[PDB]
Amino acid sequence: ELQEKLIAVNRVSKTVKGGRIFSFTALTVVGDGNGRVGFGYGKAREVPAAIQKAMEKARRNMINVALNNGTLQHPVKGVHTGSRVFMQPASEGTGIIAGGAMRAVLEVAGVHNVLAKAYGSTNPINVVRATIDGLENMNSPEMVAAKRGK
Amino acid sequence: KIRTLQGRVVSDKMEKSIVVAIERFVKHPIYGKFIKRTTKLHVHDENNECGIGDVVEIRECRPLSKTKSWTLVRVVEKAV
Amino acid sequence: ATVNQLVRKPRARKVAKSNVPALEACPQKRGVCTRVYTTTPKKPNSALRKVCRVRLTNGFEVTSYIGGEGHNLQEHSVILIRGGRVKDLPGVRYHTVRGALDCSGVKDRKQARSKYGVKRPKA
Amino acid sequence: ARYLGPKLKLSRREGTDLFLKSGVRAIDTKCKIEQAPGQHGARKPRLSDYGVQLREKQKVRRIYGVLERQFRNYYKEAARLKGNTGENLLALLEGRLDNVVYRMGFGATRAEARQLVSHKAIMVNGRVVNIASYQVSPNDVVSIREKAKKQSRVKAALELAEQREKPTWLEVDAGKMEGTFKRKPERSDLSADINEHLIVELYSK
Amino acid sequence: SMQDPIADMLTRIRNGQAANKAAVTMPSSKLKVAIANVLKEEGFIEDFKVEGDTKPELELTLKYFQGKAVVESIQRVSRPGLRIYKRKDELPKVMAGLGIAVVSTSKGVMTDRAARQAGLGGEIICYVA
RNA sequence: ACUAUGGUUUUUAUU
RNA sequence: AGGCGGCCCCCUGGACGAAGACUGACGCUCAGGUGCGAAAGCGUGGGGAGCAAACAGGAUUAGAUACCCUGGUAGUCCAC
RNA sequence: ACCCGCAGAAGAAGCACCGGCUAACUCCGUGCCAGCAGCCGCGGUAAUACGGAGGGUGCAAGCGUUAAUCGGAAUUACUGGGCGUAAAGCGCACGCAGGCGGUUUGUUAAGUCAGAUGUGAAAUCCCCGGGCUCAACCUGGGAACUGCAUCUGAUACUGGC
RNA sequence: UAGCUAGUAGGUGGGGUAACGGCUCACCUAGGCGACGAUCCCUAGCUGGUCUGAGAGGAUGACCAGCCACACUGGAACUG
């Protein structure tokens, strides 16, 4: 169907004259509910404005994934500078499992049968960029049936 | 048909006895690579003709002597 | 490790050992008590603290903490000792029990009556 | 184990009616609802977002009168059935004996039905049962002992059950005091206040 | 001199396509030629040729198409220090059906398909996708 | 071709 | 490898190429082992121009224990 | 064991939490003092954190507390960690043995894989006929034990010669 | 815990034992053990099973189906 998720609202130190001033950052995922994923981030002096500046970017660029029979085919890896994410096909509904920097990226793409591990990195804005790599590394069999002989 | 082990002679300094190192090539109890762990055995020999560096085949009885139950059934190859 | 490593020297476990070893894996034991002391307030934490020297049933002699307002503890009282850390004191691992033996209860208590020795002593 | 505390005060914390201890004393007039919970419970929210998913979970527990370790057992016993596990949790809580004895009209409330079960008045397939958590199936015969078939409290609950709108997946006759399931409870005749989205993923932190 | 001839064969193939080269060459062996046979016969390479009698040498002609890379993952799994074996009931799956597996069996270098159609198990030669 | 000695504690996070 | 520099004569390990000829797996890493010293310090003698721990001679300074400044032993050097 | 009946509301409740994380809150006392205990941290007059209240929230013939120990712990890491600054490349060498070893014919068939014959009692995990109301528990039918041993084949790749 | 044995190491004719073996006597021999750890010494019963993870692994062998080994503390074996 159509999922739409907020992953993390975080503080920032923002050290200034007089000590510190109030500031927040937000991370959201929207995409197109099935087959396309899209994300956004934004920063503001109030939470509802940081969430706006995240959501106003969450359709600006979309990443398409090829599926067959409603989902992805094989266990897959994906990386970003300072983050790695690995994914394994498991039980539908009972195999989810994993936080928003992994699970919510697949929820807005129409996948509910895959579990994920970061094995180190936890900062959501840098982990989500490594989940978004694995979706372009996963190969679906239908449109590649002519890439080798016989 | 008898089930028999092979090894290399490491001492022959006894008029009715030899000492043999068995060609035991086995997988480690917790690790996956195959390794040499050659058993050093005391073996009966009443021909007294084979010597150190020879290759031999052995069979099990019966206890034959003190802490010994294995005997020579073939001299497989001579030194060197 | 390579396909040849750990074959000669297998991996050998590191043991951490007990944080409250004087109790010898028991929950609570009797201590006779000999000396009571006071200590300095720890930098920003503005309160003076109270502790005692206690010999146990197994012959170990340890520093026991005294929590709560009011104390009747002295030489050869014979009281009950427990495992309990105080993260505001240096190396304090052992604490005292109010609900047993010679020990007086904590002053002004009326809530959490199962702890603190709120029930009257026998006479 | 059991819960024995006040039952109306549970509505003050939820902000709506749980329909616990039903009677005309708590219907259509003088009901108040919410107003001033506790002594200071109406100052300022707060609550945050974990309180919402906790209070939905506790609403299921308090309606059917089931404890944390048995509610964890129903979350295991429930099946996903290619949809949501919480849906079959609500089907197991509908099929337990004290809720079935309540639906069949032998007692006017889920707690009145539980008192009849533990006080040895109720039978299953011709034998006495005192376990309120007993799971009922199609064609399991629910009936009553003769010295409770006389009891005006049971007759009045069955006489109210014909003056209220009926559960149509089951058959019952007050003239004999006997009933059976004929179908499963259908979600296109039955309704609920419980948000199924907050009971799908439980006990996984 | 050479401590693993097939690690050099697999490196020469895997990196040769990343150097965009038409062909790659090495000392020839009936193991390298049997691996080249199944790679041609399952359509992953274009040709293999041998020249010489006292110094036999192999040349592999790399396969190219409309897309990018014909060989996308070529993983040995079984090595001369630590070998990995498979049995009839559990003959392996590769990238959920995007790839295939190669085994030496008791007869010669073949696909997991040709092995399960004779009832054979054995050592893994490579997983190819 | 220069000076020993003046201890110690602090704030914005909600809609 | 810490190290090796003004310039000779006499011995010497190793790196590298062009064209030919033999061995015929001779490669490659190394448990334990046996080996290679920079400076300081030492054992045994020789030597001592300049310099220089320690130390003395005078200031500087609260002190001077350091900077300043003249001397000077250990050392700097040699065959081992 | 169990059952069939009968007065009489009769004989039967405590204990811990409620600053933030963490759902349940701020008045009276104390005044950086005293007391705290999963962690961040609390308190010098209006303390949701200490001590008490009244009111909630949670467990309930149990409530709170505790010792060792498995999981998470890839936290002695084949599986599955790390080595320029973080904990670690042997200060630098030559080296045997051990490990690895180009390419090929012939052989042995140990290692591997395919197939027989024997066996792993009973209770217990799993499915199920019975018993008891759920179920602990107890029986009756199914069922799992990669191995080892006596045997049979394959020659790909190594080991052996 | 690096060097250690010498009834230790292998034989011949008898003894003993249900049978076996230096278990043992008299005579012949000079061998045996060690990086795959000899020398030397602290703790500890064993299995079916039991707990734990999805596994490797680690914890646990008390529950009762079988075994161990002790019986004031040590010795001997006799009877069977």
Swiss-Prot record, chain B:
Domain of life: Bacteria
Keywords assigned by UniProt, alphabetized: Antibiotic resistance, Ribonucleoprotein, Ribosomal protein, RNA-binding, rRNA-binding
GO BP terms, alphabetized: cytoplasmic translation; response to antibiotic; ribosomal small subunit assembly
This protein's record includes keyword Ribosomal protein: yes
Quaternary structure and partners: Part of the 30S ribosomal subunit.
Family according to the record: Belongs to the universal ribosomal protein uS17 family.
Protein name, as recorded: Small ribosomal subunit protein uS17
Biological source species: Escherichia coli (strain K12)
Gene: rpsQ
From Swiss-Prot, chain C:
Pfam family, one: Ribosom_S12_S23
In-chain residues carrying the UniProt-annotated modification N6-acetyllysine: K107
NAD is among the record's keywords: no
Annotated CDD domains: Ribosomal_S12
Protein's GO biological process: cytoplasmic translation; Group I intron splicing; maintenance of translational fidelity; positive regulation of RNA splicing; response to antibiotic; RNA folding; translation
Gene Ontology CC annotations of this record: cytoplasm; cytosol; cytosolic small ribosomal subunit; ribosome
Outcome (variant: K87Q): Confers low-level resistance to streptomycin and a 15% decrease in the translational elongation rate
Keyword match Heme: no
Residues annotated with 3-methylthioaspartic acid modification: D88
Listed SUPFAM superfamilies: Nucleic acid-binding proteins
Listed InterPro entries: NA-bd_OB-fold, Ribosomal_uS12, Ribosomal_uS12_bac
GO MF: misfolded RNA binding; rRNA binding; structural constituent of ribosome; tRNA binding
Keyword terms of this UniProt record: Acetylation, Antibiotic resistance, Methylation, Ribonucleoprotein, Ribosomal protein, RNA-binding, rRNA-binding, tRNA-binding
Comment field (misc): At least 19 substitutions or deletions in 11 codons can promote streptomycin resistance, dependence or pseudodependence; all but one of the streptomycin resistant mutations (K42R) are associated with hyperaccurate translation and thus reduced translational efficiency. The streptomycin sensitive allele is dominant to resistant alleles.
HAMAP family per the UniProt record, alphabetical: Ribosomal_uS12_B (MF_00403_B)
Family, similarity comment: Belongs to the universal ribosomal protein uS12 family.
Subunit comment: Part of the 30S ribosomal subunit. Contacts proteins S8 and S17. Interacts with ArfA. May interact with IF1 in the 30S initiation complex.
Name of the gene this protein is made from: rpsL
UniProtKB/Swiss-Prot annotation, chain D:
Biological process annotations from GO: cytoplasmic translation; DNA-templated transcription termination; maintenance of translational fidelity; negative regulation of translational initiation; response to antibiotic; ribosomal small subunit assembly; ribosomal small subunit biogenesis; transcription antitermination
Entry keyword rRNA-binding: yes
InterPro entries, A to Z: Ribosomal_uS4, Ribosomal_uS4_bac-type, Ribosomal_uS4_CS, Ribosomal_uS4_N, S4_RNA-bd, S4_RNA-bd_sf
Domain S4 RNA-binding: 95-155
Disulfide bridge map: none
Subunit structure: Part of the 30S ribosomal subunit. Contacts protein S5. With proteins S3 and S5 encircles the mRNA as it enters the ribosome, which may play a role in mRNA helicase processivity. Some nascent polypeptide chains are able to cross-link to this protein in situ. The rRNA transcription and antitermination complex (rrnTAC) consists of RNAP, NusA, NusB, NusE (rpsJ), NusG, SubB, ribosomal protein S4, DNA and precursor rRNA; S4 is more flexible than other subunits.
Protein name (Swiss-Prot/TrEMBL): Small ribosomal subunit protein uS4
UniProt source species: Escherichia coli (strain K12)
UniProt lineage: Bacteria, Pseudomonadati, Pseudomonadota, Gammaproteobacteria, Enterobacterales
Swiss-Prot record, chain E:
Organism (species): Escherichia coli (strain K12)
GO molecular function: rRNA binding; structural constituent of ribosome
PROSITE patterns: RIBOSOMAL_S8 (PS00053)
Cited Pfam families: Ribosomal_S8
Gene Ontology CC terms, in alphabetical order: cytoplasm; cytosol; cytosolic small ribosomal subunit
Name of the protein in its database record: Small ribosomal subunit protein uS8
Keywords: Repressor, Ribonucleoprotein, Ribosomal protein, RNA-binding, rRNA-binding, Translation regulation
Function: One of the primary rRNA binding proteins, it binds directly to 16S rRNA central domain where it helps coordinate assembly of the platform of the 30S subunit.
Protein family according to the UniProt entry: Belongs to the universal ribosomal protein uS8 family.
One GO term (biological process): regulation of mRNA stability
Superkingdom as given in the UniProt entry: Bacteria
